[PDB]
Design an enzyme around this catalytic site. Structure first.
Site, PDB file in Angstrom:
ATOM      1  N   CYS A  46       0.811  -1.130  -0.039  1.00  0.00           N
ATOM      2  CA  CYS A  46       0.147   0.068   0.007  1.00  0.00           C
ATOM      3  C   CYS A  46       0.794   1.104   0.091  1.00  0.00           C
ATOM      4  O   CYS A  46       1.612   1.778   1.062  1.00  0.00           O
ATOM      5  CB  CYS A  46      -1.081  -0.027   1.185  1.00  0.00           C
ATOM      6  SG  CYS A  46      -1.528   1.707   1.766  1.00  0.00           S
ATOM      7  N   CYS A  87      -0.204   4.118   2.689  1.00  0.00           N
ATOM      8  CA  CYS A  87       0.606   3.573   4.062  1.00  0.00           C
ATOM      9  C   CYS A  87       2.105   3.874   4.102  1.00  0.00           C
ATOM     10  O   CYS A  87       2.514   4.439   5.058  1.00  0.00           O
ATOM     11  CB  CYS A  87       0.179   2.050   4.108  1.00  0.00           C
ATOM     12  SG  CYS A  87      -1.499   1.255   3.789  1.00  0.00           S
TER      13      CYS A  87
END
Length: 108
Positions: free
Chosen positions: A32, A35
């Site tokens: 991700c 993230c």
């Protein structure tokens, strides 16, 4: 891993639900992009917010159990806990400025 609690599904109750204060949990994954954009910012927050809250990270792939309990879909999701109860929810990436405003507003 200086101030950041590296959470697991087994450690989640003790680390988050039983803590006498505020915990900012980051639900996240290695693949991700957003993230990984916010990780250095969480490092910053953990330092800046000593004594006000603890930052804890839960990787939702290595620890699959916990996220379904809090309805998590999009990642990163940041949940502010105060003594085991969720006070504030933030989904997606945001800046240091934006996160500080989120925390300052909700820590009060």
């Amino acid at each position: 891993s200086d101030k950041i609690i590296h959470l697991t599904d087994d450690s989640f109750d003790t680390d988050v639900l039983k803590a006498d204060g505020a915990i900012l949990v980051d639900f996240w994954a290695e693949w991700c992009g957003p993230c990984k954009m916010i990780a250095p910012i969480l490092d910053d927050i953990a330092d800046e917010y000593q004594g006000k809250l603890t930052v804890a990270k839960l990787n939702i792939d290595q620890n699959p159990g916990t996220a379904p309990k809090y309805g998590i879909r999009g990642i990163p999701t940041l949940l502010l806990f105060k003594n085991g109860e969720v006070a504030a929810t933030k989904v997606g990436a945001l800046s240091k400025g934006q996160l500080k405003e989120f925390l300052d507003a909700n820590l009060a």
